[PDB]
Amino acid sequence: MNTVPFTSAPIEVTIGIDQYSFNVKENQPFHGIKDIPIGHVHVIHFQHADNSSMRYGYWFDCRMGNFYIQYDPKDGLYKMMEERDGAKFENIVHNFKERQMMVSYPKIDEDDTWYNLTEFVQMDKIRKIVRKDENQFSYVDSSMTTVQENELSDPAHSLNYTVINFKSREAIRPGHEMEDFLDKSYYLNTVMLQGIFKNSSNYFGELQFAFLNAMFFGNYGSSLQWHAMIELICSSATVPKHMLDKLDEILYYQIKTLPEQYSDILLNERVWNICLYSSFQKNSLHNTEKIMENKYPELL
Amino acid sequence: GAMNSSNYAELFNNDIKLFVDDTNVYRVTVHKTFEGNVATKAINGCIFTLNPKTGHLFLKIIHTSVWAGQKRLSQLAKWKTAEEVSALVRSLPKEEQPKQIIVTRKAMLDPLEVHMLDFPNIAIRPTELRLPFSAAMSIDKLSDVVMKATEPQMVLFNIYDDWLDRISSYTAFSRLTLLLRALKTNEESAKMILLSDPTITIKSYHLWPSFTDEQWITIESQMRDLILTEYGRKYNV
Numbered sequence: 001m002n003t004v005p006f007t008s009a010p011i012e013v014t015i016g017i018d019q020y021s022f023n024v025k026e027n028q029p030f031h032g033i034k035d036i037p038i039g040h041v042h043v044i045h046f047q048h049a050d051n052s053s054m055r056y057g058y059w060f061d062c063r064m065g066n067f068y069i070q071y072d073p074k075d076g077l078y079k080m081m082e083e084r085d086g087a088k089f090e091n092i093v094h095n096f097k098e099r100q101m102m103v104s105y106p107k108i109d110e111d112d113t114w115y116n117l118t119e120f121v122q123m124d125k126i127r128k129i130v131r132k133d134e135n136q137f138s139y140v141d142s143s144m145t146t147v148q149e150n151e152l153s154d155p156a157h158s159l160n161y162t163v164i165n166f167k168s169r170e171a172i173r174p175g176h177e178m179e180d181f182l183d184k185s186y187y188l189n190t191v192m193l194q195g196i197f198k199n200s201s202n203y204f205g206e207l208q209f210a211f212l213n214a215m216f217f218g219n220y221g222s223s224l225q226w227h228a229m230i231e232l233i234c235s236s237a238t239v240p241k242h243m244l245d246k247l248d249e250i251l252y253y254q255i256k257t258l259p260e261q262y263s264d265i266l267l268n269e270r271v272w273n274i275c276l277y278s279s280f281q282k283n284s285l286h287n288t289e290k291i292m293e294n295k296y297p298e299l300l
Numbered sequence: 301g302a303m304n305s306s307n308y309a310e311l312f313n314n315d316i317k318l319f320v321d322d323t324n325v326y327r328v329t330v331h332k333t334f335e336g337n338v339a340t341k342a343i344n345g346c347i348f349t350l351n352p353k354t355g356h357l358f359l360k361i362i363h364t365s366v367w368a369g370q371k372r373l374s375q376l377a378k379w380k381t382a383e384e385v386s387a388l389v390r391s392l393p394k395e396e397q398p399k400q401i402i403v404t405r406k407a408m409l410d411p412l413e414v415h416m417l418d419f420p421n422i423a424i425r426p427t428e429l430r431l432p433f434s435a436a437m438s439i440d441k442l443s444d445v446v447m448k449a450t451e452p453q454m455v456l457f458n459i460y461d462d463w464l465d466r467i468s469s470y471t472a473f474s475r476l477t478l479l480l481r482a483l484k485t486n487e488e489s490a491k492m493i494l495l496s497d498p499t500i501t502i503k504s505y506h507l508w509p510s511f512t513d514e515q516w517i518t519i520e521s522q523m524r525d526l527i528l529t530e531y532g533r534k535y536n537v
């Protein structure tokens with residue numbers, strides 16, 4: 001079990017850690033979050049009580065270093081930093097625990113939610129989507145735009161998701177125009193899976209990461225990427241059976257976890273209705289279809 | 301963006317453009333089978349591809365053999381249309397290729413867009429106009445060449461005949477659309493109006509009779525009258 005200590009909490013902020021969130025008051029005594037489960041990526045995110053705009057946060061993996069949070073009064077935000085002095089870090093964290101100045105990551109034992117949402121997400125892939133190689137952790141916020149979004153302006157601050165475009169030369173083989181547009185299997189399996197992602201686990205990891213950024217930061221371009229990666233699978237007549245089964249589990253826990261009051265903006269009516277009811281895979285997503293119908297029958 | 305009553309005059313500027321109408325590509329007769337079931341029998345069709353500035357009608361005949369052994373023919377027809385339009389553009393010299401293609405039905409947009417990926421600077425556009433190009437098969441010479449075809453075939457016509465020697469392309473397009481609107485709303489009457497007079501001839505390479513200017517005014521008036529009457533009948537107004 002690992003710890004992300006906080007130097008202090010100068011400004012009133014709602015802090016999230018994965019799917020949990022708590023409030024800290026201005027200058028409240030507070031020195032971080034303990035008992036964070038090893039073995040998964042994690043995200044620690046912030047929304048200032050004075051600016052409900054700009055949710056922001058940091059993806060990290062405690063196996064990759066000792067990380068702490070410190071408020072910057074010049075840039076006005078809670079910054080993740082790495083401590084290279086192992087002994088100095090243990091001592092800080094030991095003191096703060098003894099003083100009982102840390103909230104505990106509140107995982108229930110029966111609960112596999114976070115595992116299920118991050119199963120294929122790997123910190124090394126996040127850092128290729130979010131390029132800032134001097135840090136072991138990755139910053140994301142509500143306003144960051146995607147590479148594809150940019151093509152339609154600052155590159156250093158972009159989400160480098162794999163560009164999917166169903167009306168592109170990459171997606172359409174010359175001479176197979178109609179075939180490839182109505183059956184995206186060759187774009188999915190040859191171009192994306194074999195070509196770019198190398199395997200389905202990396203594909204699913206980008207899909208899961210896009211959803212999580214959409215959910216936690218309201219990052220619109222991530223939402224577009226998540227829907228696009230769902231639609232590419234659903235619009236393919238030929239998909240490995242192991243992928244369909246795993247997609248159904250992936251989407252089930254995403255739909256399960258989505259805040260009810262955000263379904264209107266986070267869920268694209270057209271994509272979901274097409275995927276669950278018109279696409280080749282309309283009958284391959286039984287758990288996802290069952291939860292969507294019982295929880296958001298309005299959308300459909 | 302979409303083409304409508306407001307940017308109507310863009311059709312007659314000097315940016316090359318083409319209209320594509322696919323309404324006569326896949327044509328069937330519906331009949332009963334011996335067992336009392338219903339079946340279709342395809343007949344030859346055509347893509348109607350028109351430069352509204354010159355009157356150029358690239359008429360691509362779609363022979364029934366193209367449907368042999370294929371499923372979902374109404375859907376295939378849209379892709380076949382897009383394939384043939386793309387092939388036409390590729391065959392044209394660069395300086396004759398359109399800068400825009402306007403499709404008369406929105407369902408042609410994705411098929412043409414996909415077939416034209418090699419021409420990213422050709423805009424594919426829909427229209428809000430209710431253009432009557434489906435009535436093209438009411439023009440006898442066009443119907444005749446489509447039905448007689450025994451193989452795929454592209455046939456050329458000037459759908460304006462020689463009109464542009466005396467009138468503008470705006471006026472020529474308005475006359476053509478009036479003629480086709482009439483033939484669409486009441487083909488028999490429309491045709492009676494155009495051929496009533498045995499003394500007015502149709503040139504070998506022309507589709508329409510050789511009316512003087514004054515005779516065109518009488519004709520156009522009579523076509524207008526036809527269209528409005530039929531409309532009163534339609535809606536009981």
Ligand SMILES: O=C(NCCc1cccs1)c1ccncc1
Binds near residue numbers: 022024030099101102
């Ligand atoms: O409440 C305590 N633990 C911090 C957790 C927090 C709960 C909600 C936001 S911060 C506590 C109280 C007093 N002295 C030491 C520890």
Ligand SMILES: O=C(NCCc1cccs1)c1ccncc1
Binds near residue numbers: 358457505
């Ligand atoms: O002027 C004609 N041809 C060249 C202009 C065009 C090019 C393509 C279609 S019309 C023409 C006229 C009458 N009948 C057949 C052809």
